[PDB]
Amino acid sequence: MLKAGVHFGHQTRYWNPKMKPFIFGARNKVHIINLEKTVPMFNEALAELNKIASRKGKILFVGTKRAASEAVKDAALSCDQFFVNHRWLGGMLTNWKTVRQSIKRLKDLETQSQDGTFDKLTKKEALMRTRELEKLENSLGGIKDMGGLPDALFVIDADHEHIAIKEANNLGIPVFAIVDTNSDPDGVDFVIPGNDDAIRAVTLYLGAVAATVREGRS
Amino acid sequence: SLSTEATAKIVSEFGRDANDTGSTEVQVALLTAQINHLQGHFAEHKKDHHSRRGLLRMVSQRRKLLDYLKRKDVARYTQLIERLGLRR
Amino acid sequence: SMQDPIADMLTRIRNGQAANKAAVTMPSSKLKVAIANVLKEEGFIEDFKVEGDTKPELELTLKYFQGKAVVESIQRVSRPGLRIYKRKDELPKVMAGLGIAVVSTSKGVMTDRAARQAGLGGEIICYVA
RNA sequence: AGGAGGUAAAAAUGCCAA
RNA sequence: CGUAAAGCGCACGCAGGCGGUUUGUUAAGUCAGAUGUGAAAUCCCCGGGCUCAACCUGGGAACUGCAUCUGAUACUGGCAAGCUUGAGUCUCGUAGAGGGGGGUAGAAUUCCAGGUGUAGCGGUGAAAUGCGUAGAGAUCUGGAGGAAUACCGGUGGCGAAGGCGGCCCCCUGGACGAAGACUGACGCUCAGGUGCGAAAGCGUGGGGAGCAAACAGGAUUAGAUACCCUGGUAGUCCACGCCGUAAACGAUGUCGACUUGGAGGUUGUGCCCUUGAGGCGUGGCUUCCGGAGCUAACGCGUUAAGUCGACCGCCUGGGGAGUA
């Protein structure tokens, strides 16, 4: 079943040979992934994250790629969940006892700048703090609403965000990666094959993971 | 050279037929036809050590086949060397 | 110079597990099929097939439990440069019992536990840890 | 994106053990 | 045993070691049972006796061994009949600094004879030695001689290694490819043995342009029997013998099988639309990167230093010493 007109594949010769379970060549020598093995495993993943959605579990979303950051911001607040859409911070989960100290620094400066000391002492240095704020606003985006560690982790590109999959596998976190043919699907538990460089492809997976986790928060 | 004319008489003279180019007796008669042939070549030169090595393979190829044939088929082994005039 | 096809069999088995393959196909024999029976009854493999008439290619089928290989490590002992035979009472034991050792006795190709219980030694082919 | 020419007169050694 | 000590420079090969696959036979090896012996003491075991202990003693266990008889026959071996996949042959072709021999051509240097022509040239950090007014150097014509083969030319090709480069002929090795045919394990490895083996040396007889150990002069320097400069003999060249060593080095022995990929080079070949620098394969060889794995690490990574098999060579702290 063609769920939409893009799942097929990418990278055209830079294929990791440990994705030999799901490949198909084409005229331009590209590796197409066939749907007949991923769309059951796609519907495998959508059931398995509703199991942890019933636990009131915190699900975090990752992926930037300059053209996927837009809807990860959108699909996270679409249900209630959390996301890192901008440039990821290497070492935030396995060193959460040090990135929390900047989260606490954020919620001071988010509180005081939104009303209060934005003028009181130095106008130029008040522009320093709101120059400090908005760069911290995107890097620590929807993480400040969570508190503590997540329970799962839905990735949209295995190769690009390879720090987090290595970081989450240091702890006990089952992750969910949309994998492209160039990456290596070993650290991911619930591997999902499919394209991830087309914008219309990402709105399928983000639209599915949002609407399913809405059903899981009963 | 041991031309296609030259070998075709040898395989007819020794083989079970003309299609029998593989026998032990055919190969030895091919080697002694060539080992004798290059004796004229390796007289005036005597210092071409490179192509002399290809003769020493042809010698040692012949020696291993006779020791196989003697272990196998003694009646034809003492047929060939008096058909060729070799073995010391 | 393929001077020992039994060690070639286990080296196909050992590398076949490390590459996570499905099958391993090799030329057949009388002794190689006799060993592959002892692994099949032991549960170390799935059932084999002897594919061929005159150029017989024996194929195997591997087994993995979680992601690990079912065969931990398999190594030949009586190699063609040094053959080892032992009696009944001086039989070996692999993993203090819970690893097998396929031996060759005059009554046939038997396990370590069987030929000790049948009470006769023979040619110790290889250990399966 | 690719590519050519030109560019230093000599100048040594430093005690034993910590 | 890539770099810590250790792969013979490379090859061929006798003895030696190891050997595909199917069937039958024997039963040597091997395995089973039994008898004979394997002295006792000693050790061990379960017991006993000296107040206990050491000491002494009862029986078993052992003596892992060889020999015999009866067996068992998978495996190895011996014998006999095979088989084809290992090796080998034949047919058609391709590519190549593979080798030996004999020719041959151009550029250039040096020299020789001269023409024109005029004071330097040459060299260097600078200079000097040297050369030049007896006419150099610069230039032109002509001639001789030796040696080497610009461009092509490339981690390109070839060879066992050393190594091999204008072109042409003759003799000649080896590899590779396609579709068929044949022989039937004829195989792998290799002590001793035999063969090849850069450069430099050595011997005889030729050759000698250039280059250049020694040597001389000039500088340099504290000194400089060195770098640098000007010269310059052996030597390098050829024919034939000898020497037998190199960082003779992918510092990695040879053969075979197996185990993710990617970008090229080179040389075959098939099919397809040659329809255009193609499309998809299938072989040989080669370069770089890199996964699992391995490794002390660095790094090797289908051409292993991965996972195994068969033989061979060698290592055992450094010096003394690869010396006496």
Swiss-Prot record, chain A:
Return the InterPro entries for the record: Ribosomal_uS2, Ribosomal_uS2_bac/mit/plastid, Ribosomal_uS2_CS, Ribosomal_uS2_flav_dom_sf
Q: Which Pfam families match?
A: Ribosomal_S2 (PF00318)
Q: Name one GO molecular function term.
A: zinc ion binding
Residues the record lists as N6-succinyllysine modifications: 107
Q: Where are the transmembrane segments?
A: none
Tell me the GO BP annotations in alphabetical order: cytoplasmic translation; ribosomal small subunit assembly
- Is Nucleotidyltransferase tagged as a keyword? no
Q: Which NCBIfam families match?
A: rpsB_bact
Q: Which family does it belong to?
A: Belongs to the universal ribosomal protein uS2 family.
**Can you say what this protein is called?**
Small ribosomal subunit protein uS2
Gene it is expressed from:
rpsB
From Swiss-Prot, chain B:
Regulation: induction: Part of the metY operon that extends to pnp, also has its own promoter.
Source domain of life is Bacteria
Q: What does this protein do?
A: One of the primary rRNA binding proteins, it binds directly to 16S rRNA where it helps nucleate assembly of the platform of the 30S subunit by binding and bridging several RNA helices of the 16S rRNA. Binds to its own mRNA, stabilizing it 5-UTR and preventing its translation. In the E.coli 70S ribosome it has been modeled to contact the 23S rRNA of the 50S subunit forming part of bridge B4. In the two 3.5 A resolved ribosome structures there are minor differences between side-chain conformations.
Q: What's in the GO CC field?
A: cytoplasm; cytosol; cytosolic small ribosomal subunit
The similarity comment for this entry is: Belongs to the universal ribosomal protein uS15 family.
* GO MF annotations, alphabetized: rRNA binding; small ribosomal subunit rRNA binding; structural constituent of ribosome
Q: Does the keyword rRNA-binding apply?
A: yes
Q: Entry's NCBIfam families? A: S15_bact (TIGR00952)
Q: Name one GO biological process term.
A: cytoplasmic translation
The name on file for this protein is Small ribosomal subunit protein uS15
Q: Which SUPFAM superfamilies does this UniProt record tie to the protein?
A: S15/NS1 RNA-binding domain
How this chain assembles, per its entry, is:
Part of the 30S ribosomal subunit. Forms a bridge to the 50S subunit in the 70S ribosome, contacting the 23S rRNA.
Which Pfam families does the record cross-reference, listed alphabetically? Answer: Ribosomal_S15
**Which SMART domains does the entry link to?**
Ribosomal_S15
Keywords of the record: Ribonucleoprotein, Ribosomal protein, RNA-binding, rRNA-binding, Translation regulation
UniProtKB/Swiss-Prot annotation, chain C:
Output the Pfam families linked to this UniProt entry: Ribosomal_S8 (PF00410)
Sorted keywords for this record are: Repressor, Ribonucleoprotein, Ribosomal protein, RNA-binding, rRNA-binding, Translation regulation
Sorted alphabetically, which Gene3D superfamilies does this protein's record hold? 3.30.1370.30, 3.30.1490.10
Of the GO CC terms on this record, one is:
cytosolic small ribosomal subunit
InterPro entries to which the protein is assigned, alphabetical: Ribosomal_uS8, Ribosomal_uS8_CS, Ribosomal_uS8_sf
- Give the matching SUPFAM superfamilies: Ribosomal protein S8
Question: A Gene Ontology MF term for this entry?
Answer: rRNA binding
Protein's GO biological process: cytoplasmic translation; regulation of mRNA stability; regulation of translation; ribosomal small subunit assembly
Note the superkingdom of the native organism.
Bacteria
Concerning HAMAP family, the annotation shows: Ribosomal_uS8_B
Q: Which family does it belong to?
A: Belongs to the universal ribosomal protein uS8 family.
Explain the purpose of this protein: One of the primary rRNA binding proteins, it binds directly to 16S rRNA central domain where it helps coordinate assembly of the platform of the 30S subunit.
Q: How does it assemble?
A: Part of the 30S ribosomal subunit. Contacts proteins S5 and S12.
NCBIfam families in UniProt? PRK00136.1
Q: Output this protein's name.
A: Small ribosomal subunit protein uS8
* Gene source species: Escherichia coli (strain K12)
